[PDB]
Design a binder for this molecule. Structure first.
Ligand code: ZN
Length: 267
DNA sequence: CTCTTTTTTCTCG
DNA sequence: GCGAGAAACAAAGA
């Protein structure tokens, strides 16, 4: 899940569980709660969900007066709202039970994490993570973006994936953004000219905002996505580029699968 | 059987 | 600090 998918899940949860009182919390995989499961169970049982926020790819449950549950879905994390009598599924790990239903977290690879922290510790938590600005015209300043790119010799794709230049890009959208901005994934950032950096900046915002609008790329929150039908290069190996007709190629960059058009994205 | 494929953060040199 | 490689872990395909 990348920013668009996490925002979609955030919106669905905001509309469905806010105001709900947590009756009980159970786990079959307590170790994914990095701050301690039994401690979380004792602290949150009986509290009411006040809201759901997001920072980068991180989900933030606002519970009770001063509690913040930080959830990261990593690669395969999935949330679903089910009936209280719903049967257990093989990869379900945690569940928050409410009066008329339950929120279940499942993760095949077990990479996802939960961390319970205080309201005043949220900003410090993300500062420590070094997460960059949200991908919006208001928060994503092109000037700083440009200066950081000009000082570096890192390849653009790996650098964007660091989450430090801007938050939210994953393997899918980084490939889509670079194709839209006509930049090759291995291009060293200090070689990007002003006009290209400007195109990149806007493309990052446009692609992600479009993905959010379309519910991301897909009983399972955030599965109604339509952005997958708008992808131009990710997983399109062998297919023809919609702009020039050349075949999309796939290579490895810093260990990640990378899709790009050899013509539109000159090395 | 073996090898490869699919977010975050550490290890090694 | 950096790049390269890989671990955390599970499933499916060549
Ligand atoms: Zn092309």
């Amino acid at each position: 899940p990348e920013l668009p998918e996490v925002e979609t899940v955030r919106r669905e949860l905001e509309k469905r569980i806010v105001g709900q009182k947590i009756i009980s919390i159970e786990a079959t995989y307590p170790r994914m709660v990095l701050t301690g499961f039994e401690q979380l169970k004792k602290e949150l049982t009986g509290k009411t969900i006040q809201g759901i926020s997001r920072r980068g790819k991180y989900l933030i449950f606002e519970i009770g007066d001063d509690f913040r549950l930080i959830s990261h879905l990593r690669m395969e994390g999935k949330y679903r709202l089910a009936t209280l009598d719903a049967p257990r599924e093989k990869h379900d790990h945690l569940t928050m039970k409410f009066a008329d239903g339950q929120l279940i977290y499942a993760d095949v690879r077990k990479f996802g994490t939960w961390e319970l922290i205080s309201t005043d510790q949220v900003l410090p938590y993300f500062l420590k993570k070094k997460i960059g600005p949200e991908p919006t015209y208001e928060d994503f300043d092109e000037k700083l973006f440009r200066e950081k790119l000009r000082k570096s010799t890192k390849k653009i794709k790996p650098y964007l994936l660091e989450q430090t230049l801007v938050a939210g890009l994953g393997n899918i959208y980084v490939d889509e953004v670079l194709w839209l901005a006509k930049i090759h994934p291995e291009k060293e950032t200090n070689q990007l000219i002003e006009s290209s950096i400007h195109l990149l900046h806007d493309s990052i915002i446009e692609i992600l905002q479009k993905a959010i609008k379309l519910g991301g790329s897909s009983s399972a929150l955030g599965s109604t996505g339509k952005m997958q039908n708008e992808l131009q290069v990710y997983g399109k190996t062998g297919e023809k580029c919609s702009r020039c007709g050349a075949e999309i190629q796939k290579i490895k960059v810093a260990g990640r699968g990378t899709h790009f058009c050899p013509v539109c994205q000159q090395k």
